[PDB]
Design a protein around this nucleic acid. Structure first.
Ligand SMILES: O=P(O)(O)O[C@H]1[C@@H](OP(=O)(O)O)[C@@H](OP(=O)(O)O)[C@@H](OP(=O)(O)O)[C@@H](OP(=O)(O)O)[C@H]1OP(=O)(O)O
Ligand SMILES: [Zn+2]
Lengths: 561, 48, 96, 48, 167, 229
RNA sequence: GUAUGUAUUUAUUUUAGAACUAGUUACUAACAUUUUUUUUUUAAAAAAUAAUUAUAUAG
């Protein structure tokens, strides 16, 4: 049958394989685990709620053959456009609209657009020399310009010192053009995104058609007649351009387009959301996670922050007038700290955040990401981080979309389970969270006064011991801190002001509590373990990792010799 | 609609004989007749 | 555009002089009898020999005008003059 | 004027005769605002 | 024209940099804040070698519209009260942390949604239209110049923490 | 590979690994493709009044009397439905000429502002990109093969780390407090092995010898070992 | 998670007991993520094997 249909090439030109960006078709084949619906088919679940589970595989099937289903050579069909994107779907399939909305959710089309606009404008700021550009002014256009397919304005304007000797319009790669014909004072750059069908995906005809329509027509308001039009095909991973060149534009723009097309984060978030919507694996894990073998990377000179969301959406259960109970939201905190200097930016989320909305455990992810983006924007460039460690893996996807706005900040998911949720159970923190009447940022210094007598790395591991104790037993440890009434806490201060001998003894009490309770709970004694295994336990690191394997192999190699 | 589409087939291969494949037919008399005869049938229905 | 109201005839349209219609250019002597009126609105609306009146209900031509319209309308004539062409394509073969 | 007599102000009828909502509707509003076949048939004729 | 400049400098040596907290909650307060910002810039200018020297020109350029608004009494009062609270906790000797905390009140504010969030999931409801951020947002999102000078106040705060560390 | 089924690993009879599948352009699909171009080709292509031999009297395009380049058949759906085909440039030249004629027809500091610059010796829709910064993949547009990872937005430099050749993993170089943790970690492991024997079979207490289990003791012990030397 | 319903007044109308104590059952809650193949003896003995998961469900 595969020779009957013509081969994998003539099968895969129908499919959405070109937009995913796997390297080869051979990676279509994996032991794919179903994930969500596997968990959900066993639960106690309504009659109406169980037939909804069976339209999850149909959305993936409809996504995969979506160039062929949403093709352009149709018999009858009135073309409509999606809401916050620019996709024209011929008629009405309800499965395909859900798939493409899930792909382009959180306003991703417009983020891709202004991402490529700022990237072009930053390259043109970098080259106010030898192109002889006076100024590159970025235009402020209508927020619906990213997907107004009727007409468009320009969004980058190039004003020159004296004159530009400007060629006749031709494509980006036509190698022969005379610069002598025309003279302009200013030029315009414009970026057009199209989503291609199975039929209509000749991108060069698209860019020449958009240029030759929008320059001659009167609806599209351009500053000068001279400019260039840049077009990108998102469904099929292609680019081209058309318009007026001078001496120096074309080799700059073709290299700009190939590197932006390979390394834009926005287009990577698109291709990743496509791979997720099709449920296919591609391991691209260039930097290792924050495991126990990397552990001291936190204590470099460069600034970085831990973000944590576990206490952002909390509720209280209460009895209704009927039999069933209901949940009402309470105050929350976004736990962000930097481990080198102990600054603790504590975002108190009031309940006026959750005022009218619902689903409330999906929205909390986007609330944390939006608030972290506001915190990072409020910092200066020298004081913005260079790295952000996300604790839970469900906080990757909102932070990636909101940190599209800051491309120079790395994001590393952690590999070791961190106890910062137990930071709610400190009464000085819990008090300030609960008494709040207004959504606000409150600063704490979680290393109380330790950084004078105690260096920062042992202070972080001390805080690890304390928070693992308060997450493990929560009252035995809270009584271990509160043995003596003589040691108080100050007004500025979080922890009881112990001397350092007392910190040595109480850290010993904490590791005794943690390791004894662990060995009692999981029926595995601490004494027969490696020092690697205990350092693995206390930091909350997980086994089945590749790092535990390669660490044990490296220790075996080091101790066999 | 199918009538108009069928009429296109019998007009184009009288028009495009020995002159290619482009647009530019513009012999719009038969399709115009089809949609007028639709309109007189849906006058009494849409008044109702 | 979808958000543009329809422009007023009295301002934007009526003061513009019109443009050139199709108008196949006729010969001067081969198409002599039909040249001066072929492309009017109602071609002989007021010519009481060739029409009844401006009510425009009946028509009567000579022979050269009718012959000229016969030659000039070559691409849309029937050009089947014997009834034995429709041997098994007449209406009644279709009914059978 | 028919749409605005019926109480439906969040439906927008632009000058190329398309009917699209100006917000995200509730279900009560989607019940109150299902226009018939007759409205949309007259609407597509005006569009043509 | 140099006469008004000279008499204004003579008045500039007359007025003093004292933020009283009862005086915060109008033109003389704006001038006192204006002059304290100038004095912070002068204490940078005395010690330009040890810091980053590359930030100083850009800091002056980003601060210059703020200094202009404080010179002309044109700054909005809700924003100016927050700025004066930052500058008070900056002026006090030891509470350098309350300066950064009131700065976080200055830049983000007390708005529920600082930056808007749009189209969270597949399922669209009407109340999502309340989320977005054109209506009420942070002061760091009002205009792009306001972002520059609000960031520059934080930069002067970090300068002042270094200066009270060493000198 | 393990994953592919046996209905793909099998070559048919008439191809007598998996050479038979390789020819969109799979197997370099990670590299994005470009515009193929615009190619508009025209090819070349008895009656009583024409006098030519080709057609019939009903088909003659001349006017009935009393007595040629053709679109070459390309079948892309964009190419048959293209609005701009055989475009020479007449409309753009009329546009440029009209604009040239129109262009031919066409052709401060305040007191307090001067005071402040003399002292200083010199719209909620606005984006969050923060224009004055620069992305990291833009500095290497000219050469090839950028160092920016689009998944995790780190920019691999030579100062920042080094690549293991066999694992293809970028492990960062450490600086100050990372060195003072790593050399202290090795110190705690060595002090533990000399204090007991800690050979990891002897099955006794050794909870006091893991570093993270009790760090303040090891910080002060490292410190006094520095003080003694 | 919907449907659907319910709540949101100010502009003034005349004159047998008392005390102490902890867990067991049901039901509800869009509120929350510690491997595979064995063998043998009565804890010990053998054999083995491989750069890391979903924000998606409604009558
Ligand atoms: O026959 P239809 O389904 O109505 O589609 C035709 C058809 O295209 P295909 O038959 O290849 O699908 C014609 O092609 P030819 O019969 O001429 O080969 C023609 O194209 P031409 O303009 O080249 O005649 C025409 O185009 P138009 O729409 O301008 O009448 C139109 O295409 P669409 O219906 O797809 O627009
Ligand atoms: Zn002929």
């Amino acid at each position: 049958v595969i020779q009957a249909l013509g081969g994998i090439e003539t099968i895969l030109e129908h499919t959405l394989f070109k937009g995913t960006g796997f390297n080869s078709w051979e990676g279509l084949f994996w032991e794919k685990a179903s994930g969500f619906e596997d968990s959900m088919q066993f639960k106690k679940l309504t009659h109406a709620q169980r037939t909804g589970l069976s339209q999850i595989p149909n959305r993936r099937f409809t996504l995969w053959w979506s160039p062929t289903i949403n093709r352009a050579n149709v018999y009858v069909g009135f073309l409509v456009q999606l809401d916050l994107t620019g996709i024209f779907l011929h008629g009405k399939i309800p499965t395909l609209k859900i798939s493409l909305i899930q792909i382009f959710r959180a306003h991703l089309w417009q983020k891709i657009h202004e991402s490529i606009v700022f990237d072009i404008c930053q390259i043109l700021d970098g080259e106010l020399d030898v192109l002889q550009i006076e100024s590159v002014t970025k235009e402020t256009v209508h927020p619906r310009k990213s997907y107004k397919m009727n007409s468009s304005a320009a969004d980058i304007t190039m004003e020159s010192v004296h004159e530009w000797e400007v060629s006749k319009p031709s494509l980006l790669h036509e190698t022969n053009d005379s610069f002598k014909g025309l003279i302009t004072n200013k030029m315009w750059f414009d970026v057009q995104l199209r989503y291609g069908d199975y039929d209509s995906h000749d991108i060069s005809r698209y860019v020449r058609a958009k240029f030759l329509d929008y320059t001659t027509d009167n609806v599209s308001m351009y500053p000068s007649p001279t400019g260039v039009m840049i077009g990108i095909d998102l469904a099929y991973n292609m680019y081209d351009a058309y318009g007026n060149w001078f001496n120096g534009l074309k080799p700059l723009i073709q290299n700009s387009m190939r590197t932006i097309m390979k390394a834009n984060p926005a287009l990577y978030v698109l291709r990743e959301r496509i791979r997720k919507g099709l449920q296919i694996y591609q391991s691209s894990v260039q930097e290792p996670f924050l495991n126990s073998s990397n552990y001291a990377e936190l204590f470099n000179n460069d600034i970085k922050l831990f973000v944590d969301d576990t206490n952002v959406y909390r509720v209280t259960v209460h009895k209704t007038f009927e039999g069933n109970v209901a949940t009402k939201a309470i105050n929350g905190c976004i736990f962000t700290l930097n481990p080198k200097t102990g600054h603790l930016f504590l975002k108190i989320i009031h309940t006026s955040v959750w005022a009218g909305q619902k689903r409330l455990s999906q929205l909390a992810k986007w609330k944390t990401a939006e608030e972290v983006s506001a915190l990072v924007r409020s910092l200066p460039k020298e004081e913005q981080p260079k790295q952000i460690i996300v604790t839970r893996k469900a906080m990757l996807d909102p932070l990636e979309v909101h940190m599209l706005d800051f491309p120079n900040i790395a994001i590393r998911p952690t590999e070791l389970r961190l106890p910062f949720s137990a930071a709610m159970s400190i009464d000085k923190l819990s008090d300030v969270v609960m008494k709040a009447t207004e959504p606000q940022m409150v600063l704490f210094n979680i290393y109380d006064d330790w950084l004078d007598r105690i260096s920062s790395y042992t202070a972080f591991s001390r805080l690890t011991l304390l928070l693992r104790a308060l997450k493990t037993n929560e009252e035995s440890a809270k009584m271990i801190l509160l043995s003596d009434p003589t040691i108080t806490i100050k007004s500025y201060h979080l922890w009881p002001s112990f001397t350092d001998e007392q910190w040595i003894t109480i850290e010993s009490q904490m590791r005794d509590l943690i390791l004894t309770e662990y060995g009692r709970k999981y029926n595995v004694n601490i004494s027969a373990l490696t020092q690697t295994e205990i350092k693995d336990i206390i930091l909350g690191q997980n086994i089945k990792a590749p790092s535990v394997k390669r660490q044990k192999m490296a220790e075996l190699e080091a101790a066999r010799s | 609609i199918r009538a108009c589409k069928d009429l296109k087939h019998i007009i184009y291969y009288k028009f495009n004989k020995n002159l290619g494949k482009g647009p530019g037919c513009g012999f719009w008399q038969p399709a115009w007749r089809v949609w007028l005869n639709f309109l007189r049938g849906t006058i009494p229905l849409l008044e109702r | 555009d979808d958000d543009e109201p329809p422009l007023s005839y009295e301002q934007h349209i009526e003061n513009i002089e019109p443009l050139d219609p199709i108008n196949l250019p006729l010969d001067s002597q081969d198409d002599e009898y039909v040249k001066d009126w072929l492309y009017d609105s109602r071609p002989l609306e007021e010519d009481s020999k060739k029409v009844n009146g401006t009510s425009y209900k009946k028509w009567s031509f000579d022979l050269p005008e009718m012959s000229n319209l016969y030659r000039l309308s070559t691409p849309l004539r029937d050009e089947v003059t014997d009834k034995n062409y429709y041997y098994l394509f007449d209406k009644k073969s279709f009914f059978n | 004027l028919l749409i605005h007599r019926k109480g439906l102000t969040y439906l927008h009828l632009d000058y190329n005769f398309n009917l699209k909502p100006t917000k995200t509707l509730t279900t009560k509003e989607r019940k109150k605002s299902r226009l018939g076949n007759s409205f949309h048939l007259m609407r597509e004729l005006l569009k043509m | 024209r140099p006469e008004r400049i000279q008499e204004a400098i003579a008045q500039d040596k007359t007025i003093s940099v004292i933020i009283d907290p009862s005086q915060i909650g109008k033109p003389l307060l704006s001038m006192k804040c204006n002059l304290y910002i100038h004095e912070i810039l002068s204490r940078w200018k005395a010690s330009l070698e040890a810091y980053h020297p590359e930030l100083f020109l850009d800091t002056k350029k980003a601060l210059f519209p703020l200094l202009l608004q404080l010179r002309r009494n044109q700054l909005a009062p809700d924003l100016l009260i927050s700025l004066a609270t930052v500058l008070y906790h900056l002026q006090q000797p030891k509470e350098i942390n309350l300066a950064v905390q009131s700065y976080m009140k200055l830049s983000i504010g007390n708005v529920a949604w600082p930056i808007g969030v749009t189209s969270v999931g597949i399922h669209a409801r009407s109340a999502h239209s309340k989320i977005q951020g054109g209506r009420n947002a942070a002061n760091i999102m009002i205009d792009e110049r306001t972002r520059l000078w609000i960031t520059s106040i934080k930069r002067l705060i970090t300068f002042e923490e270094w200066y009270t560390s060493n000198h | 590979n393990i994953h592919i089924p046996r209905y793909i690993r099998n070559q048919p009879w008439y191809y007598k690994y998996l050479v038979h599948h390789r020819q969109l352009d799979i197997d370099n699909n990670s590299e994005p493709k470009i515009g193929m171009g615009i190619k508009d080709e025209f090819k070349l292509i008895f009656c009583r009044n024409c006098g030519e031999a080709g057609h019939k009297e009903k088909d003659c395009m001349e006017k009935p009397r009393k007595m040629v380049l053709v679109r070459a058949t390309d079948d892309d759906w964009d190419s048959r439905k293209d609005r701009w085909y055989g475009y020479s440039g007449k409309e753009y030249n009329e546009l440029i000429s009209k604009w040239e004629r129109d262009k031919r027809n066409k052709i401060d500091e305040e007191i307090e502002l001067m005071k402040l610059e003399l002292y200083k010796d010199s719209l909620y829709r606005t984006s969050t990109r923060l224009r004055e910064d620069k992305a990291a993949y833009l500095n290497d547009i000219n050469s090839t093969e950028s160092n920016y990872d689009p998944k995790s937005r780190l920019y691999k430099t030579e100062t920042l780390g080094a690549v293991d050749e066999k694992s293809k993993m970028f492990r960062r170089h450490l600086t100050g407090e990372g060195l003072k943790l790593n050399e202290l970690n090795q110190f705690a492991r060595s002090h533990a092995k000399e204090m007991g024997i800690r050979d990891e079979i002897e099955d006794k207490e050794k909870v006091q010898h893991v570093l993270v289990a009790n760090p303040t003791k090891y910080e002060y012990l490292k410190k006094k070992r520095e003080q003694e030397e």
